[PDB]
């Protein structure tokens, strides 16, 4: 519930030498619409010669997942900055929505590469339709046939306020 995917459409301000300017559309992941629009101008400034003071926003809409109850495999392309230089990566995730996949990606990059939110560009998010499109071995073991496994050494849940138990707890639940 931290992120949502938005559609943002923007335009250069019309002038007499060019009425009816072109329209550009981007897909932005953001926690709210105030930072969705700020993110839009950031990316457009890097591609076209437009600013916020010489343009305007046309439309903002929320894109919802079409089947948020079906398990899917996702692939993501991204570009990030390390302490010296920039690099490209491709990672994979398994969940039920595009928003869930992006949230897991941001946590994963912070843990394994110490990359902050401010140094990551998302290039493309694609749902992998065929089971033959899975590349990473940590996903392949999850799409194996006839999967099943037990849960050994499970610690029982005990109220914090209850100190001084009178029996030795078990771990076979």
């Amino acid at each position: 519930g931290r992120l949502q995917e938005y559609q943002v459409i923007g335009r250069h301000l019309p002038t007499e030498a060019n009425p009816n300017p072109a329209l550009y559309r981007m897909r932005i992941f953001a926690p709210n619409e105030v930072v969705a629009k700020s993110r839009f101008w950031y990316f457009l400034r890097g591609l076209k010669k437009v600013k916020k003071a010489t343009g305007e926003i046309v439309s903002v809409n929320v894109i919802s997942e079409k089947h948020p109850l079906k398990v899917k495999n996702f692939g993501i392309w991204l570009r990030y900055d390390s302490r010296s230089g920039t690099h490209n990566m491709y990672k994979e995730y398994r969940e039920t929505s595009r928003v869930a996949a992006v949230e897991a990606m941001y946590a994963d990059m912070a843990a394994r590469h110490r990359a902050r939110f401010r140094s990551i560009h998302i290039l493309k998010v694609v749902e992998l339709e065929k089971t033959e499109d899975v590349k990473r071995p940590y996903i392949k073991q999850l799409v194996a046939k006839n999967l099943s496994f037990p849960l050994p050494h499970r610690v029982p849940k005990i109220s914090t306020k209850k100190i001084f138990s009178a029996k030795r707890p078990s771990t076979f639940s």
Partner: protein, 159 residues
């Protein structure tokens, strides 16, 4: 105590520009000035008489005296905690009439006619400026102007 001469530090300010040496255009000597005009000062390096001090280069003042070949101008100078009134004599090669008050002198005569035209007709008008206001609502059509979808690009080495 460092060196402090009259023209110290004027290497670039008092110099004529590139490809702008030689003869002075003669329309400079044909203008007329009256007591109460508003002029700005700009020193010409090729004339060494009636030169003003480097402080007044780039200032604007009011004429108070007219003589055979020069004018007297009044400027206000800030000295720490106060302003002081200065009176300098400048040859006309260093002065020039200013467009600072022309916008005001244009609105005054334009307001006069609009007021009299409206009074003769019978519908009131505004007669004073307003700052830029926020835009209004409008509709933008998508017909034959389909939007183009953009995405960020991957990193690559140029050299």
């Amino acid at each position: 105590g460092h060196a402090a001469g009259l023209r110290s530090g004027t290497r670039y300010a008092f110099s004529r520009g590139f490809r702008k040496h030689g003869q002075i255009p003669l329309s400079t000597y044909l203008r007329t000035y009256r007591v109460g005009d508003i002029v700005d000062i700009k020193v010409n390096g090729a004339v060494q008489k009636g030169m003003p001090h480097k402080f007044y280069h780039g200032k604007t003042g009011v004429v108070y005296n007219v003589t055979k070949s020069a004018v007297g101008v009044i400027v206000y100078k800030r000295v720490k905690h106060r302003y002081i009134e200065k009176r300098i004599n400048v040859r006309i090669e260093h002065v020039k009439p200013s467009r600072s008050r022309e916008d005001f002198l244009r609105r005054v005569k334009e307001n006069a006619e609009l007021k009299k035209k409206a009074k003769a007709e019978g519908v009131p008008v505004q007669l004073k400026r307003q700052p830029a206001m926020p835009r209004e609502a409008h509709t933008v059509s998508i017909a034959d102007n389909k939007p183009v979808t953009l995405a960020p690009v991957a990193y690559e080495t140029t050299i």
